[PDB]
Amino acid sequence: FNLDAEAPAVLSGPPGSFFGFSVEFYRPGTDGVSVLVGAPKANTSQPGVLQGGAVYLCPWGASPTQCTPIEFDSKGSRLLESSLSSSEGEEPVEYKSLQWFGATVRAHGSSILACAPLYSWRTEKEPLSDPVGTCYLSTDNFTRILEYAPCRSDFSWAAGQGYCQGGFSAEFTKTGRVVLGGPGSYFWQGQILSATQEQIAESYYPEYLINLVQGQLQTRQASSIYDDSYLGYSVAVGEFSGDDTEDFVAGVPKGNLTYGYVTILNGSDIRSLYNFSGEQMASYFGYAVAATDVNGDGLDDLLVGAPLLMDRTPDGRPQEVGRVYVYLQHPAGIEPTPTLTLTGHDEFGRFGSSLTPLGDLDQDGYNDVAIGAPFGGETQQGVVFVFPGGPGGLGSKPSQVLQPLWAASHTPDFFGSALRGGRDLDGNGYPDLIVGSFGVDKAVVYRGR
Amino acid sequence: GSKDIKKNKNVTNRSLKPEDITQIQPQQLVLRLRSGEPQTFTLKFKRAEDYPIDLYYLMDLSYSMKDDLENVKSLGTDLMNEMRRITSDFRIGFGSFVEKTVMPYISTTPAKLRNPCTSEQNCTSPFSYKNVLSLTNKGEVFNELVGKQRISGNLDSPEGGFDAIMQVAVCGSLIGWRNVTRLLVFSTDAGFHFAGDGKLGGIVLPNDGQCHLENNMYTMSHYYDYPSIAHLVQKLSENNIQTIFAVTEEFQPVYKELKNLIPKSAVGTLSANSSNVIQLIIDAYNSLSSEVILENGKLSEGVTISYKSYCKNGVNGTGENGRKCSNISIGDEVQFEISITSNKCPKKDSDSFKIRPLGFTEEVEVILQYI
Amino acid sequence: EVEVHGRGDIPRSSLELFEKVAKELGLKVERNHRTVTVKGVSEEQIRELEEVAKKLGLWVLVR
Ligand SMILES: *[C@@H]1O[C@H](CO)[C@@H](O[C@@H]2O[C@H](CO)[C@@H](O[C@@H]3O[C@H](CO)[C@@H](O[C@@H]4O[C@H](CO)[C@@H](O)[C@H](O)[C@H]4NC(C)=O)[C@H](O[C@H]4O[C@H](CO)[C@@H](O)[C@H](O)[C@@H]4O)[C@@H]3O)[C@H](O)[C@H]2NC(C)=O)[C@H](O)[C@H]1NC(C)=O
Ligand SMILES: *[C@@H]1O[C@H](CO)[C@@H](O[C@@H]2O[C@H](CO)[C@@H](O)[C@H](O)[C@H]2NC(C)=O)[C@H](O)[C@H]1NC(C)=O
Ligand SMILES: *[C@@H]1O[C@H](CO)[C@@H](O[C@@H]2O[C@H](CO)[C@@H](O)[C@H](O)[C@H]2NC(C)=O)[C@H](O)[C@H]1NC(C)=O
Ligand SMILES: *[C@@H]1O[C@H](CO)[C@@H](O[C@@H]2O[C@H](CO)[C@@H](O)[C@H](O)[C@H]2NC(C)=O)[C@H](O)[C@H]1NC(C)=O
Ligand SMILES: *[C@@H]1O[C@H](CO[C@@H]2O[C@@H](C)[C@@H](O)[C@@H](O)[C@@H]2O)[C@@H](O)[C@H](O)[C@H]1NC(C)=O
Ligand SMILES: *[C@@H]1O[C@H](CO)[C@@H](O)[C@H](O)[C@H]1NC(C)=O
Ligand SMILES: *[C@@H]1O[C@H](CO)[C@@H](O)[C@H](O)[C@H]1NC(C)=O
Ligand SMILES: *[C@@H]1O[C@H](CO)[C@@H](O)[C@H](O)[C@H]1NC(C)=O
Ligand SMILES: *[C@@H]1O[C@H](CO)[C@@H](O)[C@H](O)[C@H]1NC(C)=O
Ligand SMILES: *[C@@H]1O[C@H](CO)[C@@H](O)[C@H](O)[C@H]1NC(C)=O
Ligand SMILES: [Ca+2]
Ligand SMILES: [Ca+2]
Ligand SMILES: [Ca+2]
Ligand SMILES: [Mn+2]
């Protein structure tokens, strides 16, 4: 329909680097508009670091669209002071190798946020391998790069935040606040964790590895019965309480004895506001979440995805086709039951793996939504669907379907695994879309017409 | 339309070889569909007197289940002694699973990489899945091998046994599966890892469902993600494997729902240090073998099927239950009413599909002839 | 006071042994789902309980 599927732009990174695992827009609607692409397994030029991850900057407008890597950090793994002081010599405190840095790239204005979920660091007290989360926050066009590792705290073990794996999912609120989700905190209970950029910069002090941010907001620890809930597997932001501050949306895929549920946390607090339980057990309810107005009422509406949901064809044979649930918001409040459900049509397609608002892509007054099926298509290469909005919510039939142009190969292409949209690159007033294909280390950019 | 029965070999009567025993009366027939008008036929099922059994014991060897491993050193001979009353042919096997060997699930420090448990306990390094003993008819070897197994340790409460189930089901000849009643016992006392949890370890490739066993050890545990329940159901159904869940009382509801999802499987309540595994297995087998589920394979487009059940004791079920006949005992005849509908004239002159009871290699061949 | 957890991949059997030793030690035990907390534990009592928990592989705390 609208998106120029005839000939999109293709950005390719180093082979085997998982280029395109995460995508984002940078400085849209202004000079210097660019596309950020993460390569979690890209070899970097850091001292003694192997596959430390990288984030690429791809300027828009240039005909070749050459992509270059950003030098967020060029310092190898640190060393323990006692090790070099005592009869040890070398004993790194941190383990930056294979840290999967750049697995989550988010930007808001002049700020960028690249996280390394698998960062682990030997505790200075006793030997350990706690894989806490560490994130870097570029500010003012790379003028001052900070580091945000909130889960790297005194409580250091699986019983605490040692296995937090913070930065597994990140987001920026409209006011620049940073929201993080640590799935592995408190014996994999999970944890939402946020702080404003001003607080991060004010308390920055790189001498101490354990740095505490003042005024930080985080979810408290719960009883042992809530273990292995994976709260924070995916996060999103939207206005759901009638306040002026965007409210947090977090996914808990393995909560409620593996049925799963999604929770909305109040702004200015971290209190829970709404719960949305899953439908089928092991339907991985909460792979992705989003919040956008899909009926032009001016109120945000929640979307959820369950890629592993199993449905049976009318013949009787069961099949694995994903699902997506849409909850519409009303002046009274959101309802606990879905207002609409969308189901896949291909086996092992993982429909609903990724979701992303597209904005008023059609300029018809109703926002649109894009849903990805990493293993869909007629050759298991991956497919992306576009579902138009309307007065009654999302339309049950996709308006457009996007597929890769390159021929299939022996490795899965993971096309549509990561998506982003809602910003205009060419500046013609029509939103755009970026789709990740890290299976072959490629990212494609689509533009309205 | 019309119909005609081609082979229709008489089902074995009351009281040889697993392939010489018949349990479906009609075998092959041709249905000449006439578009709107459907065609119907009936097939008799009769449970065989004694049918060989192949049991594969898959046990969880995390630090939890430590006491259980101490009360299983006599299972090999006890189960065979308690099983001879049911069948004259029996074979048993053993297998163990702990977890994927990657960072978030297992501590990677060398001290914890060699001795995952505390220094007081002398544990072994973690492993994904090990095939201790292929199916065999001697219980002494089972006892001897299971006696010397060593417990392991891990970090997170849920254990990654689903990939072990996949490797057991798909490896076939390596596990020694036969064309008889295949039973799988899944003993654990914690939740399970399914697809999507491997992302925390940097694993994104979906499980491909292939035998990746090298020297009775499952490599590639770091390469492929955990298998989804849909994949497990598909592979178990394809391989005709009936699963028994012997899990503790704490995690009963999770496995009750799992057995609801999976077809032809039962869930037991393991107690104490595996005190009553034998009785649990026998009860589960008796419950499973007293039911029949009929399924069809890839019915052609434009063709719809209907099942009817003529059970015992005068209860005649219909609807989705028409393919299910419960409470069947040894040598108790049962009949099904099957009708095929074809609401078009597909270009395929004659396409055939097979109706097969779950867990059996016996198939009835149905050949369609449109117009 | 002492609050052992034993909530990871730890046997259920080696979690009521701590409760039995604490109760037979004259202290008070506040049972919980895969978590035990005691009250009125002295310095010697706390040291002994911590040593026992460490030997059992539990995660001992203090309050
Ligand atoms: C959406 O769905 C989620 C997931 O189910 C819900 O999350 C759960 O909500 C429960 C609602 O009560 C919470 O229970 C409460 O948890 C708090 C915090 O843990 C308890 O208070 C503190 O508990 C800790 C636990 O160790 C103690 O150390 C503290 O001393 C307690 N006090 C303070 C000030 O922190 C609550 O205690 C109440 O309940 C117990 C129950 O026995 C009672 O004995 C107490 O006297 C007291 O009345 C209470 O347990 C769950 O913790 C929470 N779980 C998670 C993972 O977040 C959420 O509520 C749902 N929201 C909606 C809107 O539906
Ligand atoms: C990053 O570089 C390393 C080493 O240069 C690659 O790991 C392998 O290293 C051995 C030598 O130690 C080479 O012989 C191999 O060729 C390297 N692998 C490959 C695929 O070339 C590592 O693979 C590189 N990572 C990426 C993403 O290319
Ligand atoms: C979300 O949290 C804010 C922060 O407290 C709540 O706003 C408070 O509302 C109470 C209600 O009387 C007032 O007494 C406080 O002064 C308010 N504080 C602030 C900072 O605004 C808000 O009500 C919460 N949202 C919901 C839906 O309850
Ligand atoms: C389960 O195992 C326990 C522990 O082995 C048994 O109780 C006894 O515990 C002591 C130590 O506390 C051991 O020295 C004994 O060997 C154990 N008895 C036996 C028979 O092994 C318990 O009896 C076993 N059965 C249960 C609990 O039903
Ligand atoms: C923003 O930055 C772009 C890239 O340069 C970056 O900033 C300089 C200072 C170096 O740190 C370099 O390594 C970084 O990659 C520029 O192309 C762009 O012009 C800058 N924006 C403005 C408004 O000047
Ligand atoms: C957990 O899931 C079940 C089944 O979907 C549901 O009935 C139950 O309400 C859920 N838990 C909660 C706390 O709602
Ligand atoms: C644990 O037991 C095995 C069995 O003999 C032994 O070889 C090993 O040395 C023991 N562990 C240690 C640390 O000695
Ligand atoms: C079992 O039946 C299958 C069905 O096709 C057949 O291929 C196989 O040869 C038979 N024998 C064994 C040992 O599996
Ligand atoms: C069930 O079917 C049998 C055999 O046709 C018949 O004798 C009996 O009356 C039927 N009873 C019911 C309740 O359908
Ligand atoms: C099975 O049948 C027997 C007698 O034929 C009856 O006593 C028993 O209640 C039946 N069980 C079920 C579950 O219908
Ligand atoms: Ca709305
Ligand atoms: Ca629109
Ligand atoms: Ca545009
Ligand atoms: Mn365990």
Numbering used by the authors:
A (entry chain A): 1 to 449
B (entry chain B): 65 to 79, 86 to 441
C (entry chain C): 2 to 64
Study authors write:
Integrin α5β1 is one of the principal receptors for fibronectin (FN), a major component of extracellular matrix (ECM) component that is extensively expressed in various cells and tissues. The interactions between α5β1 and FN are vital for cell attachment and migration, making them integral to various stages of development and tissue regeneration, notably in wound healing, bone regeneration, and stem cell therapy. Integrin α5β1 undergoes a large conformational change from the inactive closed state to the active open state when bound to FN. We use computational protein design to create de novo α5β1‐specific modulating miniprotein binders, called NeoNectins, that bind to and stabilize the open state of α5β1.
